[PDB]
Design an enzyme around this catalytic site. Structure first.
Site, PDB file in Angstrom:
ATOM      1  NE  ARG C  84      35.738 -56.055   6.947  1.00 14.67           N
ATOM      2  CZ  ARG C  84      37.025 -55.877   6.665  1.00 14.67           C
ATOM      3  NH1 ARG C  84      37.916 -55.848   7.646  1.00 14.67           N
ATOM      4  NH2 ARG C  84      37.425 -55.730   5.409  1.00 14.67           N
ATOM      5  CG  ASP C  85      31.507 -60.247  13.010  1.00 14.23           C
ATOM      6  OD1 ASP C  85      32.245 -59.706  13.861  1.00 14.23           O
ATOM      7  OD2 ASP C  85      30.403 -60.760  13.289  1.00 14.23           O
ATOM      8  CG  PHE C  86      34.236 -65.681   9.157  1.00 17.53           C
ATOM      9  CD1 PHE C  86      33.331 -66.369   8.384  1.00 17.53           C
ATOM     10  CD2 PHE C  86      35.091 -64.777   8.552  1.00 17.53           C
ATOM     11  CE1 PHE C  86      33.286 -66.178   7.039  1.00 17.53           C
ATOM     12  CE2 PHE C  86      35.046 -64.581   7.190  1.00 17.53           C
ATOM     13  CZ  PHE C  86      34.148 -65.294   6.432  1.00 17.53           C
ATOM     14  CG  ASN C  90      28.192 -63.087  12.756  1.00 19.94           C
ATOM     15  OD1 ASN C  90      27.334 -62.286  13.125  1.00 19.94           O
ATOM     16  ND2 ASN C  90      29.476 -62.950  13.061  1.00 19.94           N
TER      17      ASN C  90
END
Ligand SMILES: Nc1ncnc2c1ncn2[C@H]1C[C@H](O)[C@@H](COP(=O)(O)OP(=O)(O)OP(=O)(O)O)O1
Lengths: 492, 327, 195, 66, 71
Positions: C84-86, C90
């Protein structure tokens, strides 16, 4: 800043140097102190402006001298200057030109010498805010560097002006202090503590006390509790202060008190009955003070007042009605604000025909309630002399049925702000032989008002400008858009 | 008590920034005792509730011989963050300044001894507008819907154009429109909007916020505000006004229905014959159809993928007026 | 209440293309963790400032294949585990060019994908799928090729036409980056369609 | 003592040609009235005597006014 | 801010540590005159450049062990 005289003076000053960086930089940061030496009296910018200073009348010299009391390029409201001039006595009057119109023609006398320039002007040509060029400003400072009008450093001052945020900087105050003004640069608020406001009440000879943008620590009831020590106080504009709920009850010995202003202070519940007996008032000004119990009783007892704004006519066993307004034969500006139907009384509905010297009426039907107010407005007839009227929230749908050239022939300026007004009645045109002789017209925010343009031009033969800016429903006027934006229609 | 401390702090913030915004020249606010709005809303906990959001809650109420509408800022949500207190105060200041226009919901007063202030507004007998319409026990006639679309178009143009600083209400939404006795729409809740600086129609904010499905994904990517970022949200607003389907919809599958994607595919494939509302099909729709689909083509015109293809908001309200003036 | 749940989800995380659990303790507080060090950090440490490294040839695309392989640990053995945080901050780097990943109702303030890493159906709705994940992995691929037959994605090493990762990666992009949700790819094909 | 004169330098005069043009078309309509009178109003040291000197030291005014 | 002139008198200098530690003393960008006058170093002091002091107008160099100027 634009004057060729100062530019050529600085050029002639820097012409006799060696063009190295340091004197140029210090002249860039010390500027006023050299053009008042005039390179030891050779070019004399200060003489060329001081000769314009030195042909004023002496009261106009005093009136222009108080503008050395303001910050760098602040936009000064007219009303505060006029009330200070009326207060500490730079204006004398005998022949009817008593309070407001003498401030008006002193202000116009200063602006007609090209000393004070205007900033913005309404539809009706009146001026609200003004400013001055800074060479005039430090000229007036250097003339205040003489006689102790405005020192502002050291001991001997005759009056003082506070800038923003003096909660901690501890302005020196001696016991002379004929005035204390509050000068803000259009948006700041003077953060003040309690001890300075206690030391304001220590000044025996203090004629002007106006506090315009300030937030205090304690409520002002106990802060100004010892204003009985103030005896020769002439004006108070306690506008826009947070801790003001009840002005102090030691206000019985203030027998001079020429004006009394408190505008845009939303929490002013009770006005004391001591603003009846002193009978030497000129201006009582409560505009847009919402939470207010709408007056004491004997408003018609004092007679020498000229401006009464935000009247709020009371109920039956409350405050004061419109009956004593017939007693106030000297006023020329009058401001009504109406809430519901029982604010006015039946046989008082002819209370506005005997005001001989009346000039302007403002009606603020903002928090209106019922149709009984709409039916009871329509009998309030203004005098046949009337220069400006501004009804501005007006819950009715038709015209108020006196808006006709028969009921008021000499109307020149007129504005209509927001409203539930749908159309104008047939007496509003009245075009058999009578016409408006009206000149300035404003229709601010009307989403139900429908009329034509050539019908106006055949009913109002003496128009110059019509400023309408939110009327999404006409689309027949000559301006660029009568809907979202606004135009003026400045005709030939 | 401590009510004096509430008063002497909240109103100092209040007065300082309304002088900063408006120079004092403003609207007759009426102060209050606590007990008037305490017994008017029955001590904040009753069935007089209208509608909520993150910060605030809308109640009905009744003070002496007039019903009012009351807005409270909830304590826990505004006290968890300690830096977003200023959206409250410019909500009150912008609600004071927008009150002189007819299509807004006028601030009638304030009591300020509470969490942070508590506001009061004139009464609207229809409630707030839902994800489809009236929150009364109810069906809205279509001419009323076209009229209220025109009205909140006028209100959004008033935010964009009336001032040297362009206020951009990024949360234009069917949840903020109220309806009075005469069905005149009234926006509110200017807490989320920001003022652009003078002269510039484009600055960057530094976070992005507000209600999934109204985002302007241009602004979700780029994080700078233009007036078109308001136009896209307005477009989805009148999409919801016409269709009566919520902007987030489900059919049994993960709760995903991009409603404007559905309307553009029913445009290009279903050919505009399915957007006329099975609770409204019994309307006469004689010449009303061609202006329904004129409004739909307009709404899809103001939700295109590039803002250069989108109309300015002045134009959108003008051509809505032409649409209702066609008959 | 917040403790055996941590044991549950951290007890399943042991995969080489993640940031390994360097810091796990009592840890009564919120995130103050230091998973000790990263030698090169993320790809913003090399792509977006122009003093650390120039870009490579078809080298970092296999690092993207390694990040895809970490996602093949992510989306397949899960019951419901979605990253959920691409975005490019990251995915991380070792000295051996190793991809690493870390940092696993209604909120007004948008924080998930504040730039072009967001799915258009997610902007429209707010439900976050593993297919929004493959859309966001597609724009990760777009960024690592681009740097936000016109194959001028590079400005330093413009001879990738025989390297064929331009062709296969553009195929995976232009098939992956369509705005619908029912022809969506899967990560295994994104692995196997370049090697 | 303070005095003035129609003698100036016409090289340091930084642009006034729009105002010069407007005042020349004002002076070209002098026969329309019985006695055209005009005023230059401003604060001290603004450009009034210089714009007057710039006007009536032009050649076309000497063609008009003798 | 208001500095105009600097005079440096490295007369009774002792060691090369003084020469290495002089070279970080940077004058302000406004500087009208400087007079280094005994200066045991062999190169320029590595701030003597129009980049480090643009507005230099007057300058004198008295006795010294100075050999050549740097780039
Ligand atoms: N446009 C200009 N270009 C160059 N110098 C100018 C210009 N306007 C004015 N000056 C210079 C000329 C003088 O040195 C100085 C004063 O101008 P001048 O015209 O004599 O003042 P004024 O006529 O506006 O008012 P006053 O007669 O009261 O001094 O300004």
């Amino acid at each position: 800043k634009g004057l060729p005289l100062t530019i050529k003076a600085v050029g002639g000053l820097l012409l006799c140097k060696d063009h190295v960086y340091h004197e140029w930089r210090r002249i860039a940061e010390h500027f006023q102190d050299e053009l008042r030496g005039n390179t030891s009296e050779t070019d004399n910018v200060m003489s060329s402006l001081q000769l314009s200073y030195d042909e004023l009348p002496s009261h106009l010299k005093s009136c222009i001298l108080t503008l050395s009391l303001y910050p760098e390029d602040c936009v000064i409201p007219k009303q505060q200057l006029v009330h200070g001039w009326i207060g500490e006595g730079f204006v004398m009057w005998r022949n009817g030109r008593s309070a407001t119109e003498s401030g008006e023609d002193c202000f116009s006398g200063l602006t007609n010498r090209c000393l004070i320039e205007v900033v913005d002007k309404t539809y009706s040509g009146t001026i609200i805010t003004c400013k001055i060029h800074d060479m005039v400003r430090d000229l007036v400072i250097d003339i205040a560097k003489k006689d102790s009008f405005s020192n502002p450093e050291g001991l001997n001052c005759r009056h003082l002006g506070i800038s923003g945020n003096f909660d901690e900087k501890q302005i020196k105050v001696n016991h002379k202090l004929r005035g204390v003004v509050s000068t803000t640069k259009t948006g700041e608020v003077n953060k003040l503590n309690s001890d300075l406001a206690k030391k304001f009440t220590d000044c025996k000879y203090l004629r002007v006390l106006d506090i315009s943008k300030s937030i205090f620590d304690a409520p002002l009831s106990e802060i100004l509790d010892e204003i009985a020590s103030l005896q020769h106080l002439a004006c108070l504009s306690l506008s826009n202060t947070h801790p003001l709920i009840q002005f102090p009850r030691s206000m019985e010995d203030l027998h001079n008190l020429q004006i009394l202003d408190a505008s845009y202070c939303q929490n002013l519940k009770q006005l004391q009955p001591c603003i009846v007996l002193f009978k030497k008032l000129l201006v009582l000004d409560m505009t847009n003070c919402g939470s207010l119990e709408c007056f004491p009783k004997g408003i018609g007892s004092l007679v020498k007042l000229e401006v009464l704004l935000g009247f709020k006519p009371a109920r039956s066993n409350n405050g004061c009605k419109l009956s004593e307004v017939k007693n106030l034969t000297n006023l020329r500006k009058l401001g009504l604000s109406l809430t519901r139907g029982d604010q006015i009384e039946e046989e008082e509905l002819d209370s506005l025909i005997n005001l001989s010297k009346l000039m302007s009426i403002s009606i603020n039907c903002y928090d209106s309630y019922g149709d009984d107010l709409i039916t009871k407005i329509d009998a309030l007839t203004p005098p046949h002399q009337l220069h400006e009227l501004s009804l501005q929230f007006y819950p009715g749908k038709s015209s108020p049925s006196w808006l006709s050239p028969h009921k008021l022939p000499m109307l020149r300026y007129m504005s209509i702000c927001s409203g539930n007004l749908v159309k104008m009645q047939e007496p509003f045109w009245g075009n058999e032989n009578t016409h408006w002789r009206i000149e300035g017209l404003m229709l601010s925010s009307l989403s139900d008002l429908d009329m034509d343009w050539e019908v106006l031009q055949q009913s109002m033969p003496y128009l110059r400008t019509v400023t309408a800016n939110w009327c999404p429903e006409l689309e027949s006027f000559a301006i660029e858009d009568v809907g979202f934006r606004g135009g003026v229609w400045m005709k030939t | 008590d401590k009510a004096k401390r509430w008063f002497l702090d909240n109103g100092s913030i209040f007065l300082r920034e309304l002088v900063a915004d408006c120079n004092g020249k403003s609207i007759p606010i009426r102060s209050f005792s606590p007990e008037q709005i305490l017994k008017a809303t029955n001590n904040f906990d009753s069935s007089c509730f209208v509608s909520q959001d993150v910060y605030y809650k809308w109640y009905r109420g009744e003070i002496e011989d007039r019903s009012y509408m009351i807005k409270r800022f909830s304590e826990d949500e505004i006290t968890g963050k300690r830096h977003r207190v200023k959206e409250v105060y410019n909500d009150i200041v912008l609600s004071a300044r927008m009150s002189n226009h007819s299509n807004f919901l006028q601030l009638l007063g304030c009591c300020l001894e509470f969490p942070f202030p508590v506001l009061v507004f004139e009464f609207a007998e229809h409630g707030a507008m839902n994800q489809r319409g009236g929150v009364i026990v109810n069906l809205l006639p279509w001419s009323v819907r076209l009229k209220i679309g025109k009205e909140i178009a006028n209100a959004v143009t008033y935010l964009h154009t009336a001032f040297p600083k362009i206020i951009i209400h990024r949360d234009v939404k069917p949840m903020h429109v109220f309806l009075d006795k005469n069905w005149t729409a009234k926006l509110s809740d200017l807490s989320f909007s920001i003022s652009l600086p003078e002269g510039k129609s484009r600055i960057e904010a530094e976070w992005v916020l507000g209600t999934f499905g109204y985002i302007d994904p241009l602004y979700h990517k780029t994080c700078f505000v233009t007036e078109y970022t308001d136009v896209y949200s307005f477009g989805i607003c009148l999409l919801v006004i016409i269709t009566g389907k919520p902007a987030i919809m489900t059919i049994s599958d993960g709760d995903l229905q991009g409603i404007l994607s559905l309307v553009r595919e029913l445009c290009e494939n279903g050919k505009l014959d399915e957007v006329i509302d099975p609770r409204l099909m019994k309307d006469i729709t004689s010449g009303q159809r061609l202006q329904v689909e004129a409004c739909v083509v307009l709404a899809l015109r103001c939700c295109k993928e590039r803002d250069e293809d989108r109309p300015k908001m002045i134009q959108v309200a003008k051509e809505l007026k032409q649409i209702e003036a066609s008959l | 209440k917040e403790w055996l749940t941590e044991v549950n989800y951290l007890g399943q995380l042991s995969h080489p293309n993640l940031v390994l659990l360097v810091g796990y303790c009592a840890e009564g507080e919120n995130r103050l963790l230091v998973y000790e060090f990263m030698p090169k950090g993320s790809l913003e440490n090399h792509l977006f400032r122009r003093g650390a490294q120039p870009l490579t040839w078809a080298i970092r695309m296999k690092v993207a294949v390694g990040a895809a392989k970490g996602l093949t640990f992510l989306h397949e053995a899960k019951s419901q585990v979605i990253y959920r945080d691409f975005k490019a901050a990251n995915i991380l780097l070792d000295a051996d060019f190793n991809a690493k990943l870390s940092d696993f109702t209604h909120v007004s303030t948008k924080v998930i994908g504040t730039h072009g890493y967001a799915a258009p159906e997610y902007v429209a709705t707010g439900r976050l799928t593993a297919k929004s994940d493959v859309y966001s992995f597609g724009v990760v691929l777009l960024e690592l090729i681009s740097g936000r037959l016109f194959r001028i994605m590079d400005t330093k090493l413009g001879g990738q036409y025989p390297q064929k990762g331009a062709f296969t990666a553009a195929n995976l992009a232009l098939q992956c980056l369509n705005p619908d949700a029912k022809l969506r790819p899967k990560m295994s094909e994104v692995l196997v369609t370049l090697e | 003592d303070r005095w003035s004169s129609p003698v100036y330098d016409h090289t340091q005069v930084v642009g006034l040609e729009g105002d010069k043009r407007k005042i020349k078309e004002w002076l070209f309509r002098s026969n329309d009235s019985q006695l055209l009178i005009m005023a230059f109003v401003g604060m001290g040291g603004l450009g009034k005597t210089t714009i007057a000197q710039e006007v009536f030291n032009d050649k076309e005014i000497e063609h008009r006014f003798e």
